[PDB]
Amino acid sequence: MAFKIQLDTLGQLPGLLSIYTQISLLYPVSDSSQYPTIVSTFEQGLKRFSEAVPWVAGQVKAEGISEGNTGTSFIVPFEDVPRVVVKDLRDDPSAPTIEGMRKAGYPMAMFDENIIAPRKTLPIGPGTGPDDPKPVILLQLNFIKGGLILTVNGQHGAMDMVGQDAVIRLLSKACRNDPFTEEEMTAMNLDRKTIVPYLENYTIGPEVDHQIVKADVAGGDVSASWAFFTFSPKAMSELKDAATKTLDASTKFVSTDDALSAFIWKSASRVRLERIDGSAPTEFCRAVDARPAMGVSNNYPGLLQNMTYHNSTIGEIANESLGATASRLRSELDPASMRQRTRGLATYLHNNPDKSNVSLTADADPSTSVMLSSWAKVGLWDYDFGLGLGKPETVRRPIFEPVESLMYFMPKKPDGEFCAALSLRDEDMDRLKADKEWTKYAQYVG
Numbered sequence: 001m002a003f004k005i006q007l008d009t010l011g012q013l014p015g016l017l018s019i020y021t022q023i024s025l026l027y028p029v030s031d032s033s034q035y036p037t038i039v040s041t042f043e044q045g046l047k048r049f050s051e052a053v054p055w056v057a058g059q060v061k062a063e064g065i066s067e068g069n070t071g072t073s074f075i076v077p078f079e080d081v082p083r084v085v086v087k088d089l090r091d092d093p094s095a096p097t098i099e100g101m102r103k104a105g106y107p108m109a110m111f112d113e114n115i116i117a118p119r120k121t122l123p124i125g126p127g128t129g130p131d132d133p134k135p136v137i138l139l140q141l142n143f144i145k146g147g148l149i150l151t152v153n154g155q156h157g158a159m160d161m162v163g164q165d166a167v168i169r170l171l172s173k174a175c176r177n178d179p180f181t182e183e184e185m186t187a188m189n190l191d192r193k194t195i196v197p198y199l200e201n202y203t204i205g206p207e208v209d210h211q212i213v214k215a216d217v218a219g220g221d222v223s224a225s226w227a228f229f230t231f232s233p234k235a236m237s238e239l240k241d242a243a244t245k246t247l248d249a250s251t252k253f254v255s256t257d258d259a260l261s262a263f264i265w266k267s268a269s270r271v272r273l274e275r276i277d278g279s280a281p282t283e284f285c286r287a288v289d290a291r292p293a294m295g296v297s298n299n300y301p302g303l304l305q306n307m308t309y310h311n312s313t314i315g316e317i318a319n320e321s322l323g324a325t326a327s328r329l330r331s332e333l334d335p336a337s338m339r340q341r342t343r344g345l346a347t348y349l350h351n352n353p354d355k356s357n358v359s360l361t362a363d364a365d366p367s368t369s370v371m372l373s374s375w376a377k378v379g380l381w382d383y384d385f386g387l388g389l390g391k392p393e394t395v396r397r398p399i400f401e402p403v404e405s406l407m408y409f410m411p412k413k414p415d416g417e418f419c420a421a422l423s424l425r426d427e428d429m430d431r432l433k434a435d436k437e438w439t440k441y442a443q444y445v446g
C-alpha cells in the first residue's frame, strides 16, 4: 500500500506548512493498575485506524523546491502506524498532577508542550529541520498522578483543527472497535487538490486582500505570555445578550462566538489605549472553517479554512457598543462571500509556484491586531477512546512560545463554558487582568 496525496492547495501556505497543532485531553485515572490496558487499547486503535485509512500513518513531504518555487507537498508513506510516545510522569516532581490541575483550574502553564507533547508547535529545536520527517499525526500518552494526558499533534499543512477533530473522532471509534460509516470513509478519502474549484483567468482580486505580504505593509507569519481565561455559561449568555441588544441595522443576529470574539477585541483595544492613541489602526483576523461554504463534509480531514478581516481603529473598537463590534464580525460570514474569497486564495496559490508571500496574517500588526482561531465547535469533549475512564475532564491547548495577539477558543465545554487562550505583551496582559469590565466576565486561569 502506497499513496501520494497532494495537500490541499490552501495547505501549501508557508505559515501552515511548518507548524504542528496540539491539543491535550485530560482524564482521571483511579488506579495505576489501569495504565497497561490504556496503552494497549490505544495501540490497537492506532493499528486498526491505519489498516482502514493507511495515509494517517504517513508523513508530509515537499518536492520540486527551487529558487522561486516553494514546492508542492504530498502525504506519502512513513511508518506502519502513527507514532505514540508513552511518558510516565507520576514520579516527576516538575510534572502536573490531577489534584494540582483541579485546584488551579487546568491552566495552560500546566500543559507544557515540552513535557506533554510529542513535538513542538513551532519549527524550533532538534528534529524540526526541513529534511527531518513531518509525520501527519503524532500522539503522546502521559501518565500523571491520578490521571492521563493524551496529546495529539496534527501537521498543519495536512489538517486544520476541524480536520484534526475528524481524525481524532475516528481514532476514538477505532480504539473502541466501532465501525466507520461509509460517509466517514468517503470523507477521509476525498481528493484534496481539487476540493476548492479554481476561478477562471484569475490574476489578483479583492479575494486575497490582507493575504499577500507587501514590502510597504507591516505584518506576516517584546516580552509576552500565554494565559487561559474562562467564561461561564452565564457570562457567555450575558455577553450575547449585550451584543444582541446593540446590533447594527444590517445585522439580524449574532452568535455566542461572535459576542465573545467582539468582547475580546474591545477589551484588548481598551487596555491598549494606555500605550497607543485611539487613532491607531486595528485589524481583527478571524479563522473560519470553509467546509460549509464549499459544501464539503464536516468529516473532511484536510485543511479548508480561511480568515475574515475587520479593520477599524483602537478608539472606535473600544468605544462602540458590543453589538456594533459583533456586527462587524458577523457581516463577513455570508457563505457565498466565504466561498468566493476562499476560491480566490486557492486560485492565487495554485497560479504561483512561489508561495512565499502568501499569509493569512500578511498585514496583521502584532501590536494592535487580534488573530483569533475558535476551536469552540469541535467535538473533542465527547471522545473516550474505549479507555473506560469516561469523557475528558478538560480539553486544553498546550502552552508554547508567546505569539503576541494570537488567541484561541478551546472546544466548548458541554455545559457551555468557554476557555480563551490569549497571548499578549506583558503590559497588555497585566492591564487586562486588572481591568474591571474584563474581569466582570473573564476569570483568569493562567
Ligand SMILES: CNC(=O)CCNC(=O)[C@H](O)C(C)(C)COP(=O)(O)OP(=O)(O)OC[C@H]1O[C@@H](n2cnc3c(N)ncnc32)[C@H](O)[C@@H]1OP(=O)(O)O
Pocket (backbone or CB within 6 Å): 160, 161, 162, 240, 253, 254, 255, 256, 257, 258, 287, 288, 289, 290, 305, 333, 373, 374, 375, 376, 377
Ligand atoms: C481555526 N479555527 C477554525 O477552524 C474556526 C472554526 N469556527 C468556525 O468556522 C465557525 O463557524 C465560526 C466562524 C467561528 C462561527 O462560529 P459560530 O458559532 O458563530 O457559528 P455559526 O454557525 O456562524 O452561527 C451559529 C449561531 O448563529 C445562530 N443563528 C443561526 N440562525 C439564527 C437565526 N435565525 N436567528 C438567531 N440566531 C441564529 C445560532 O443559534 C448560533 O448561535 P449560538 O447559539 O451558538 O449562539
